[PDB]
Design a protein around this ligand. Structure first.
Ligand SMILES: CNS(=O)(=O)Nc1nccc(Cc2c(C)c3ccc(Oc4ncccn4)cc3oc2=O)c1F
Ligand SMILES: Nc1ncnc2c1ncn2[C@@H]1O[C@H](COP(=O)(O)OP(=O)(O)NP(=O)(O)O)[C@@H](O)[C@H]1O
Ligand SMILES: [Cl-]
Ligand SMILES: [Cl-]
Ligand SMILES: [Cl-]
Ligand SMILES: [Cl-]
Ligand SMILES: [Cl-]
Ligand SMILES: [Mg+2]
Length: 278
């Protein structure tokens, strides 16, 4: 859309991991602006930008909108649709835990967005988790921050950073990345949002490396025994099977009992959202 740092103006801050809510003055648009700082050769930087341009060709109700990416002052700027609901990670804070009928809708949203990305663009997400699922007051649930640029992925070296990991056992044992890996993350995210806390380990903090080792060695987490329907339980369990061959695939999940039910349920998500978030 041709954006430059002069066009913009900060309204507020939305969070970091940093992202501002900005006004794009020349067009009137309100956008979310992510700044990524990288100490990198100018040459690869331009390649990231070049590669982000693919986002202009994404068009799914399950995928956050993209306005453009550019470089300025040692910052990569990625400009996006502003989601006034924030991430399910933020929502999870305010709510303590998210009800399984809401998670049913989330699951459908995620499953659809993954399948759209994989089929129309042959790309995997690579980073499915509560903070990358965004919601808004129209009740929409959308995926964000997927691995669109191979250079950006390589430059960020995300596998070793942060306190939680949603990486799969195969990948941590040298397997190529595939869709089955995003399924594990979604299952892992669903359990986190259902019980109110990152499920690894089951209930001194683990640093990233003990965590990763735990993931490849210990049995997968599961939902507690009475609070949740058996259909939800089984769904999450099919997502968290350590052997990717055995783990369910998108087609299978899409016809699972839990999803067929959830798809039928009348949930007023925007309503629940706004009387949980404000
Ligand atoms: C943790 N996973 S990893 O594979 O190790 N590291 C990475 N994983 C995923 C992804 C990335 C890199 C990456 C990021 C962070 C990104 C952020 C916003 C964005 O804009 C946007 N706009 C609208 C809708 C959806 N996105 C596009 C983006 O493209 C990318 O390739 C990893 F670096
Ligand atoms: N388009 C958006 N609209 C509204 N809020 C957003 C948007 N994008 C990101 N955010 C918020 O900004 C915060 C930080 O985003 P981010 O920079 O990707 O770190 P993170 O994904 O939350 N954790 P990490 O992936 O480890 O850096 C998140 O908690 C989001 O809720
Ligand atoms: Cl760096
Ligand atoms: Cl974290
Ligand atoms: Cl695959
Ligand atoms: Cl049941
Ligand atoms: Cl709704
Ligand atoms: Mg994110």
């Amino acid at each position: 859309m041709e954006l430059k740092d002069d066009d913009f103006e900060k309204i507020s801050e939305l969070g970091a991991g940093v992202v501002f809510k900005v006004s794009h003055k020349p067009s009137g648009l309100v956008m979310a602006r992510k700044l990524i700082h990288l100490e990198i050769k100018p040459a690869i930087r331009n390649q990231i930008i070049r590669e982000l341009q693919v986002l202009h060709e994404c068009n799914s109700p399950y995928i956050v909108g993209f306005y453009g990416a550019f470089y300025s002052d040692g910052e990569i700027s990625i400009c996006m649709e502003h989601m006034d609901g924030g991430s399910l990670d933020q929502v999870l804070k305010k709510a303590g835990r998210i009800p399984e009928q809401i998670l049913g809708k989330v699951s459908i949203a995620v499953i659809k967005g993954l399948t759209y990305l994989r089929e129309k663009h042959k790309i995997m997400h690579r980073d499915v988790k509560p903070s990358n699922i965004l919601v808004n007051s129209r009740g929409e649930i959308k995926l964000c921050d997927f691995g669109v640029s191979g250079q950006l992925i390589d430059s960020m070296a995300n596998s070793f950073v942060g306190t939680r990991s949603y990486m799969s056992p195969e990948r941590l044992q040298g397997t190529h990345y595939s869709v089955q890996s995003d399924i594990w993350s979604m299952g892992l995210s669903l359990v986190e949002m259902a019980v109110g806390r990152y499920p690894i380990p089951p209930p001194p903090p683990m640093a990233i490396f003990e965590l990763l080792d735990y993931i490849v060695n210990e049995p997968p987490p599961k939902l507690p025994s009475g609070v949740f329907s058996l259909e939800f339980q089984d769904f999450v369990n099919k997502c968290l099977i350590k052997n990717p061959a055995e783990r369910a695939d998108l087609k299978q999940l899409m016809v699972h009992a839990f999803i067929k039910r959830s798809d039928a349920e009348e949930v007023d998500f925007a309503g629940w959202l706004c009387s949980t978030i404000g």
